[PDB]
Amino acid sequence: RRLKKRIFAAVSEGCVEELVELLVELQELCRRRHDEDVPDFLMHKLTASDTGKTCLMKALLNINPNTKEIVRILLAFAEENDILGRFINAEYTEEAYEGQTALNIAIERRQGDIAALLIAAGADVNAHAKGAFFNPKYQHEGFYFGETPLALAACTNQPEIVQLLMEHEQTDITSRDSRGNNILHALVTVAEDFKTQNDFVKRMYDMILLRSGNWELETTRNNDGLTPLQLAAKMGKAEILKYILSREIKEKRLRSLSRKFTDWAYGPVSSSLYDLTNVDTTTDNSVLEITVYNTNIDNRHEMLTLEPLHTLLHMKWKKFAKHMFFLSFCFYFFYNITLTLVSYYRPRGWLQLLGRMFVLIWAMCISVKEGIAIFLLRPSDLQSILSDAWFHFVFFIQAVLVILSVFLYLFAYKEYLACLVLAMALGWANMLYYTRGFQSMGMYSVMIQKVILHDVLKFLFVYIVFLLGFGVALASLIEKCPKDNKDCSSYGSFSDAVLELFKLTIGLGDLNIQQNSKYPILFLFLLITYVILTFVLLLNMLIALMGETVENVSKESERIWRLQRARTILEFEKMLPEWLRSRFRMGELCKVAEDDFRLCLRINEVKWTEWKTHVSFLNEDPGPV
């Protein structure tokens, strides 16, 4: 009948005077012979069959000043009918909001008092909202938070509800959603920059982790096999990653959960130990490997400035990476030197044959190494080519040109010299890769890349239009040379016209306006217009435009160079065999007396700011030993 519609309408408005009047009519209807059973008929009349929404869920979606009064009446009505368990735990049946219950709605509506009594009434604190809206494919048609009431309050900045939920005995903190994400994973995905979120996720992450007091939650891996620590690097959450990597728990009874430990401290001078169990090249997938080879984020250079990450790269740079980088340069420098000499001093012997074979063998080594390096990198976006694989191609292109030249050399084709020259020009141009390692040269090189893309490529496109646009125009009004003089005008054809204009732009040759033009005034008018457009306008503006880009890049070029250099460190470390890996960090340290040994990196810092009392140290003696 119309009773169900009236109940929903009165519930939504927020009126309790007629709410009881509608309920007592339903109680009268219960006396009627349902012929099946009492509870099922009452639930069917009190719920919407199309979507599964109940009157209690209707009230929470329609928060009113009298909503709290409605909730108690509805719960009491259900309790008297012995249907309280199946009523408060009802969820939507449609796939759009499947798994959403009354407790989830109350938490979203920020009704702490209403949610408090629902839990005491028997609400399911482990319900999973596996609906399509709660797991959207994009960031506009839904909101992902972990599909659980514990995570919903955590992601909505509701610490009071989180504390109430955690204190509940039936709450499953380590519960996993459809993606396999735990509570910590959901916070990492939800977490954003400080300008967007008021660091509430970081505080919520600490509160939930301390309540659990175990490493099971932190070491849990989702369906993608990523820990919450690894997920922060995968999604580029620098704020969360910074907290986790440098994490100190001052309070006792729980200290193994920390990732940062101070073994000793004496006044302002103190040494800190950063955990590296899951942040190192030893493991298969780690934070350091992800934060360098990631292509879906644009804040890798900011993420490499963290205390453990920055020092870890520096320590391994000066051990093996520095020597290998110099060794690689020497082999490549001799590769181009030998290649240049044999090509320059080519015929137009028995003692120098070893050098010639070196170029052919080393070209194969570069071709094979770059062939697999690009293959495993999986470049998809155009920016990734110029920001992560530009030197992986030009080295490969230069290497295969030498191989191609050798292939054409043994045949009857004379085009081997053309490919050989291209290898020389590209090979010496590839030397700018080795500018990294040095801060001055490395920051200079990354400045070139931004200048080329932002300004040089943009400038060249407009210049060519003017160069070719005036090239056809100038060559158009050129009369045929007389039978006596066959070189009457230098702008004889389109190719000649462009060459003269190109020399004009670079200030070469002499400007002879006495061409064989039927309209000398018009011919000179276009020449002066070309000079103003190119020599005065385009050439001069390029210098001014780059100065704007130089200012914007110089404040961040240092981080970019370290990001580019850090990529080289990981590549060199992978080239190392199974053995020779004795260049790791400090060995096992007894961080906790409960057989807790972790590989840690020692960092010493001095700060004359807080002047605290050191009561959270590992070793009483400050002197290193």
Ligand X SMILES: CCCCCCCC/C=C\CCCCCCCC(=O)O[C@@H](COC(=O)CCCCCCCCCCCCCCC)COP(=O)([O-])OCC[N+](C)(C)C
Residues 555-594 that bind a copy of itself (CB under 8 A): none
> Which of these ranges, 41-49, 139-147, 272-280, 437-445, lies near a copy of itself under the rule CB under 8 A?
139-147
CA distance 440 to 452: 19
Min dist CB 561 to ligand X, Å, is 8
C-beta of residue 309 within 8 angstroms of C-beta of residue 288: yes
| Closest distance of CB 622 from a copy of itself, Å | 6
The correct pick among 226, 338, 564, 603 for binding ligand X (CB under 6 A) is 564
CA distances from residue 147 to 103, 114, 135, 570 in whole angstroms, order as listed: 12, 20, 8, 37
Alpha-helical (H) ranges within 287-389 are 287-293, 300-303, 307-316, 322-344, 353-377, 382-388
- How far lies 544's CA from each of 451, 462, 548, in Å? 12, 16, 7
548 touches a copy of itself (CB under 8 A): yes
Interface stretch with a copy of itself, choices 131-139, 180-188, 458-466, 486-494 (CB under 8 A): 131-139
Task: Evaluate whether 85 touches 45 at the Cβ level (below 8 Å).
Answer: no
What is the H or E stretch that residue 112 is in? helix 112-121
Report how many residues bind a copy of itself under the rule CB under 8 A: 51
Q: How many CB atoms lie within 10 A of CB 182?
A: 29
Task: Show contacts with a copy of itself in window 145-174 (CB under 8 A).
Answer: 156-157
* CB within 8 Å of 22: residues ≥ 6 apart: 3, 6, 7, 10
Told to check if 602 binds ligand X by CB under 6 A, we report no
Cβ closest to a copy of itself, residue 289 vs residue 455: 455
Q: Which of 223, 547, 574, 597 binds a copy of itself (CB under 8 A)?
A: 547
Which range of residues in 311-319, 334-342, 414-422, 604-612 is near a copy of itself by CB under 8 A? 604-612
Query: Containing H/E element for 262?
Result: strand 260-266
SS3 helix, strand, coil % of the chain, rounded to 5?
55, 5, 40
434 near ligand X, judged by CB under 6 A: yes
Count the alpha carbons within 13 Å of 509 in the hemisphere toward its beta carbon. 12
425 interacts with ligand X by CB under 6 A: yes
Size of the site for ligand X (CB under 6 A): 74
Q: Which is nearer to ligand X, 288 or 400 (CB)?
A: 400
Of 349 and 507, CB closest to Na ion: 507
Any binding-site annotation on 509? no
For 390, the token pair is: 């530009």
Q: Which of residues 502-561 bind ligand X (CB under 6 A)?
A: 502, 505, 518-522, 525
Residue 452 touching ligand X (CB under 6 A) = yes
Task: List all residues 6 or more positions away from 369 whose beta carbon is below 8 Å from its beta carbon.
Answer: none
Q: Are 281 and 321 in contact (CB under 8 A)?
A: no
Structure tokens at 182: 């735990």
Kindly state whether residue 460 participates in binding ligand X, applying the rule CB under 6 A: yes
Judge whether 87 and 46 are in contact, CB under 8 Å. Answer: yes
* Shortest spacing between CB 455 and ligand X, in angstroms: 8
CB nearer to Na ion: give 507 or 577: 507
Q: Which of positions 348-407 make contact with ligand X (CB under 6 A)?
A: 365-366, 369-370, 373, 382, 386-392, 395, 397
Binder among 465, 511, 513, 590 for ligand X (CB under 6 A) = 465
Residues found in the chain: 625
Per-residue b or e along 34-54, where b marks 16 or more CB atoms closer than 10 Å to that residue's CB = eeeeebebbbebbbbeeebbb
CB of 552 to a copy of itself, least distance (A): 9
List the interface residues with Na ion, window 489-548 (CB under 5 A).
507
Return the range that interacts with a copy of itself (CB under 8 A); candidates 120-128, 171-179, 575-583, 599-607: 599-607
- Tally of CA atoms within 13 A in the half-sphere of 610 that contains its CB: 7
Q: CB under 5 to 8 A by kind: which of ligand X, Na ion, a copy of itself, none does 609 bind?
A: a copy of itself
Mark 21-60 with x for binding to a copy of itself (rule: CB under 8 A) and - for no binding.
------------------------------x------x--
- Please give the Cα distance from 601 to 221 (Å, whole number): 25
Q: How far is the CB of 30 from a copy of itself (least distance, A)?
A: 28
Q: Which stretch binds a copy of itself (CB under 8 A): 117-125, 407-415, 473-481, 603-611?
A: 603-611
- DSSP per-residue letters across 40-105: HHHHHHTB-TTT--BHHHHHHHT--TTHHHHHHHHHHHHHHTT-HHHHHT-BB-STTSBT-BHHHH
Residue 458: name its binding partner from Na ion, ligand X, a copy of itself, none (Cβ under 5 to 8 Å by kind). Answer: ligand X
CA distance 604 to 587: 17
Options 113-121, 189-197, 263-271, 460-468: segment touching ligand X (CB under 6 A): 460-468
Extract the tokens encoding 464.
């060519």
Residues comprising the binding site for Na(+)? 507
Binding site for a copy of itself (CB under 8 A): 51, 58, 61-64, 96-97, 109-111, 131-133, 139-143, 156-157, 192, 196-198, 200, 541, 544-545, 547-551, 554, 604, 606-609, 611-615, 620-625
Binding residues: 507
Q: Which residues bind Na ion (CB under 5 A)?
A: 507
